[PDB]
Amino acid sequence: LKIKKP
Amino acid sequence: MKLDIKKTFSNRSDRVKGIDFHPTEPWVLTTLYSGRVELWNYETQVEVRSIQVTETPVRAGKFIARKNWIIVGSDDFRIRVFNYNTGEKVVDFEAHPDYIRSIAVHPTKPYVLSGSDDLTVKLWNWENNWALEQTFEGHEHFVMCVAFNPKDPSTFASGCLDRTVKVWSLGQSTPNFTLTTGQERGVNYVDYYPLPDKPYMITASDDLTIKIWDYQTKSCVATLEGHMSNVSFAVFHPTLPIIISGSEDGTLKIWNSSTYKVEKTLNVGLERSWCIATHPTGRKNYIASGFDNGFTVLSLGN
C-alpha cells in the first residue's frame, strides 16, 4: 500500500 | 471583517489534486487524479483546453505565463510542459524514480523545483534544456510540498512526512535550518506569509493541526485546531488578512491571520479538499480549491 495514495 | 464570499464558478469533475490561477487571463488550471489536466475560463464558464497527459494521478500543476506554458508532475515519475495556446508538448522527462507531489516556479529565473516520494527536491533550468542543476538531499520521507520564499526565492521551504520543514538556499546542498514541527502524521503543505510585517511560515498535517512558524526564531507562533480530519493545505492570502485551510473533512476555513479566530467555515459540497490557489495579483481576491468531486472559484470582498 502506497502512503498518501489518494 | 466582512468577507462577502461569492461562488464565481463551480465545475464537477474527477478528483482535483493540483490547481493554479493564470495571472492575466480569467483561467484556472486543474490537475486531476484520472491523468487529465483542464484549463477553465471561470468568468465565461467555458473550457479553454483539456489534455489526457497519462493514466496515473497528476498531483502538481502550475502556469509559466511568461512562456505561455503549463508544467505538470505525475505518479509516472514525469514532468511535462505544454504551450496552452496550441496544445504542443514542449518537454516530457523522467524527473524522479517515484511520485511527483509538488512543483514551484521561480518568479524571475527559469527555475522549477519538484518535490517527490524519492525523498528529494530537484531544481530544473528550462534555459539549459531542463537540466537538473541541483538535488536537495536530507529529508527522510515523501517531500509533499515545495514553496519559494516570495520575499526571497533564492530560498525555498520543503514540507515532508518525516515531519520536518527544511529551508534551503539555491546552490547550497545543506539546509539553512530544519523545523521539527511536532506534527507526527507528517507535513502535507508549507507556505510563506508574503508581506514584510511578519517572518511567518504555515504548515498543515494529517494530525489535524495547522502551525505558524517564525523563521527568525525557529519557534511555533500558534497552533490552529479547527478540522476533524487530514489538513491538506494552509496558505496566507496575498492581500486580505486571512489564512485559508482545507481538509478531507470537505470544508474550507478562513482564519484571522492576526488573532487566529475563525471568520467562516465553508461546506462547499464536493467532499475532500486536496489543493488551493490564490490569484497572484489578488484580482477580486480570487481563491479556488480542488476537491474529490471537482473545483470551485470564489471571490472575496475588500
Author numbering:
A (entry chain aaa): 194 to 199
B (entry chain AAA): 1 to 302
What does the paper say about this structure?
Wnt proteins are a conserved family of secreted glycoproteins that govern essential developmental, growth, and regenerative processes and are also involved in pathological conditions such as cancer. We defined a signal peptide region in Wnts required for secretion on EVs, termed exosome-binding peptide (EBP). Analysis of cocrystal structures, binding thermodynamics, and mutagenesis found that a dilysine motif mediates EBP binding to coatomer with a conserved function across the Wnt family.
Isothermal titration calorimetry (ITC) confirmed high affinity binding of the 18–amino acid EBP polypeptide with the N-terminal WD repeat of COPB2 with a dissociation constant (Kd) of 11.6 μM. The C-terminal half of the polypeptide (252 to 257) is bound to COPB2 with a Kd of 37.2 μM. The interaction involves two main contacts of the lysine side chains K253 and K255 with two acidic patches at the central opening of the β-propeller top face. In addition to the two primary contacts, a secondary contact involves the backbone carbonyl oxygen atoms K255, K256, and P257 of EBP, which interact with the guanidinium groups of R59 and R101 and the amino group of K17 in the WD repeat domain. COPB21–304 at 10 mg/ml (0.28 mM) was incubated with the Wnt252–257 peptide (LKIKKP) at 3 mM during 1 hour in 150 mM NaCl and 25 mM tris (pH 7.5) before setting the crystallization experiments.
